[PDB]
Design an enzyme around this catalytic site. Structure first.
Site, PDB file in Angstrom:
ATOM      1  N   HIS A 186       0.738  -1.265   0.000  1.00  0.00           N
ATOM      2  CA  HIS A 186       0.000   0.000   0.000  1.00  0.00           C
ATOM      3  C   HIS A 186       0.753   1.291   0.000  1.00  0.00           C
ATOM      4  CE1 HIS A 186      -3.571  -2.384   0.684  1.00  0.00           C
ATOM      5  NE2 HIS A 186      -2.926  -3.032   1.637  1.00  0.00           N
ATOM      6  N   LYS A 218      -5.735  -9.316  -7.242  1.00  0.00           N
ATOM      7  CA  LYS A 218      -6.443  -8.804  -6.046  1.00  0.00           C
ATOM      8  C   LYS A 218      -7.569  -7.874  -6.548  1.00  0.00           C
ATOM      9  CE  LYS A 218      -5.001  -6.832  -1.552  1.00  0.00           C
ATOM     10  NZ  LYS A 218      -5.134  -8.041  -0.686  1.00  0.00           N
ATOM     11  N   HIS A 249      -3.091  -3.638   7.894  1.00  0.00           N
ATOM     12  CA  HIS A 249      -4.076  -3.897   6.808  1.00  0.00           C
ATOM     13  C   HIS A 249      -4.693  -2.551   6.406  1.00  0.00           C
ATOM     14  CE1 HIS A 249      -8.617  -4.991   6.121  1.00  0.00           C
ATOM     15  NE2 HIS A 249      -8.737  -4.416   7.312  1.00  0.00           N
ATOM     16  N   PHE A 250      -5.091  -2.479   5.135  1.00  0.00           N
ATOM     17  CA  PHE A 250      -5.750  -1.220   4.644  1.00  0.00           C
ATOM     18  C   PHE A 250      -7.248  -1.531   4.733  1.00  0.00           C
ATOM     19  CE2 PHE A 250      -5.529   2.981   2.814  1.00  0.00           C
ATOM     20  CZ  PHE A 250      -6.806   3.063   2.231  1.00  0.00           C
ATOM     21  N   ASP A 251      -7.991  -0.818   5.567  1.00  0.00           N
ATOM     22  CA  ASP A 251      -9.419  -1.164   5.717  1.00  0.00           C
ATOM     23  C   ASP A 251     -10.349  -0.390   4.769  1.00  0.00           C
ATOM     24  OD1 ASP A 251     -10.992  -3.085   7.322  1.00  0.00           O
ATOM     25  OD2 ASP A 251     -12.087  -1.290   7.828  1.00  0.00           O
TER      26      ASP A 251
END
Length: 124
Positions: free
Chosen positions: A12, A41, A119-121
Site C-alpha cells: 500500500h 487482487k 491492513h488497509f481497511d
C-alpha cells in the site's frame, strides 16, 4: 519471512509520487511488487504520503473495522490515495484495473510493538 507491517508497506505505500501518474498507474503498480504473482487482487489502495504520516494514523481516531474488529484507526485529515479496482478484461498474468485518484481519509488496522498499520481497511 515477510512480517505483516512489511507486507503493508509493500502492498500500500507509494511515497515516490504525489498522485496516480496516468490512468494506467494501477496496471503498472500491481505488476511491480510481485503484487500479482499469483492472483489479481480485487481491490488495492496506494497511499501517496510519507510512511511516517501513515504510521501516525495508529494513534489517531479509533474506529471499528469493516469486519467488526476494533483495532482500526481513521486519519484525522485526508490523504492522497489511489484506489485500484480489478476490471473485466483481466486475464492472469495480465491483471486489469481501474485507477481512481482521490483525496480521502484512510482507515487502517494496527498491531504490534511498534504499533503500526498491518491492513488497509477503507478510504472515506
Amino acid at each position: 519471512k515477510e512480517t505483516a507491517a512489511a507486507k503493508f508497506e509493500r502492498q500500500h505505500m507509494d511515497s515516490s509520487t504525489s498522485a496516480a501518474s496516468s490512468s494506467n498507474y494501477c496496471n503498472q503498480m500491481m505488476k511491480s511488487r510481485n503484487l500479482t504473482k499469483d492472483r489479481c487482487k480485487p481491490v488495492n489502495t496506494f497511499v501517496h504520503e510519507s510512511l511516517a504520516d501513515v504510521q501516525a494514523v495508529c494513534s489517531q481516531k479509533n474506529v471499528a473495522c469493516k469486519n467488526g474488529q476494533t483495532n482500526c484507526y481513521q486519519s484525522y485529515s485526508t490523504m492522497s490515495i489511489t484506489d485500484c479496482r480489478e476490471t473485466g478484461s483481466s486475464k492472469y498474468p495480465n491483471c486489469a484495473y481501474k485507477t481512481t485518484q482521490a483525496n480521502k481519509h484512510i482507515i487502517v488496522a494496527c498491531e504490534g510493538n511498534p504499533y503500526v498499520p498491518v491492513h488497509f481497511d477503507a478510504s472515506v
